[PDB]
Structure formats: C-alpha cells, structure tokens
Design a protein around this ligand. Structure first.
Ligand SMILES: [Mg+2]
Ligand SMILES: [Mg+2]
Length: 117
RNA sequence: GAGCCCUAGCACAGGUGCUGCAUGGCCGUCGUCAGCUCGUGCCGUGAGGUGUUGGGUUAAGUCCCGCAACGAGCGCAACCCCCG
C-alpha cells in the first residue's frame, strides 16, 4: 500500500554517480546501480509529511520546483491541483533572494494580461 | 532751468598685448563605430566579475535561443525633414 506501492518502480536510481553523503539512504548495488532503501524512505516521508501537513493547516505556502523534463508536467499539475506556486521552466536567478525585483515582472505580466482585451 | 554740446580736474575707459595646461561656450576627431553604464541579486578577502562570456541572426548590445540573474539607462532604432 505504501512501500509495496513504492517498490512499484519508484526507488533505486543512480550508478556510482553518487554523492557519498547519501550512503545512509542506500541499500545495496544491484547490477551497477544504487538501490535506495525504502524502509528508510518510509521513515523520512512520515517526518516530511508531518512537517508538510503542519505547514498547510496553518496558511502555509509551498513553492514547488522541478525543471527537469521528467517532472515539468507533473509539478505544474500537482501544484495547480493544490493552489501552491510552482517553478517549471528556468529557475531564475534570485527568484527568492531577489524576489523584490523579480516580482516587478509578475506585476508587468498582469498589467499585460490587462491588454489582452 | 533740464536735456544736450565744447574746456579743464577727478574717478575711469581702451588694449586683435600674453596664457586654449587657468577657463566657459562652440567645434574637430576616434566614429554613426556598436558600444558605455546602472539598480537589486548572485560570485570574489579584494580590485572586480556576472548582467553585457556562449549558439544563431542583424546595419546595430537588432532580434532569438541559452544562462545566477531579473530589469533599467545613455546609445541603435523609432518619433522630425526631403525624394518616390
Ligand atoms: Mg584644449
Ligand atoms: Mg595653438
């Protein structure tokens, strides 16, 4: 239901293209490829989802980010489907640290929206 | 008696005499070449860098694509005149 739904095909990826700080999450090497251990994915999903839940049930807002082409279409769907914002194409330099300045273009976007009709 | 005009005296005028390395103003010139910058972010101990390195395209930093940058300004172009 959980970790049987995950073993679906939704774990193990890379192949000694690894960052060795991620060893605490790794189970073994099946066939040249690192197999991430789901019994510990279990663990972090509970902790992360606890933190997400909390966040939501108090007016919290979560910027979803994923630009790589496998996730592009997923992140937009799920993001619209929660009314949270998403970054999908390029992540622009300073969307956060320069948010003051980048927003000024959201304000331009809507003011150009306003010359549609 | 005030304009006004000559005589002498007083202040002063006059100087195309010097310095264009004391200057203003205006002009030439590189060059109508495609450049030169800024605000915030980010990188760097720092000068500084990114933006404005790359690929394409244009008469052009013109436009596109890309990208720790997102924008903007002086330029380019347009707004002006002539010719068709
Ligand atoms: Mg001079
Ligand atoms: Mg001389």
């Amino acid at each position: 239901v959980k970790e049987l739904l995950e073993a679906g095909v939704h774990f193990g990826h890379e192949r000694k293209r690894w960052n060795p700080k991620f060893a605490r999450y790794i189970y073994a090497e099946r066939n040249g490829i690192h197999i991430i251990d789901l019994q510990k994915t279990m663990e972090e999903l509970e902790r992360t989802f606890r933190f997400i839940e909390d966040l939501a049930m108090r007016g919290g807002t979560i910027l979803f980010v994923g630009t790589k082409k496998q996730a592009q279409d997923i992140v937009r769907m799920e993001a619209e489907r929660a009314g949270m914002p998403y970054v999908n194409q390029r992540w622009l330099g300073g969307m956060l640290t320069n948010f003051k300045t980048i927003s000024q273009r959201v304000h331009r976007l809507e003011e150009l929206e306003a010359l549609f009709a």
